[PDB]
Ligand binder design. Structure first.
Ligand code: BOG
Ligand code: BOG
Lengths: 22, 22
């Protein structure tokens, strides 16, 4: 479960990074 | 890296739970 959580967090980071770029 | 991240999250949870108790 915490590996899944870490994976979700990594993807949230990517989303936020792309939103900041937009 | 995901194993390390998961482990850090687990330990942060423990730290926060203990602080909350105090
Ligand atoms: C404390 C409340 C503010 C929360 C800020 C969370 C951090 C924003 O997280 C995002 O992380 C990415 C790293 O992968 C960066 O590339 C983005 O620019 C940054 O917006
Ligand atoms: C799976 C969640 C990942 C984020 C990890 C770091 C933040 C955990 O935030 C939570 O804060 C509460 C104190 O108000 C504690 O009681 C919880 O035990 C702790 O898990």
């Amino acid at each position: 479960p915490l590996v899944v959580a870490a994976s979700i967090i990594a993807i949230l980071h990517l989303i936020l990074w792309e939103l900041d770029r937009l």
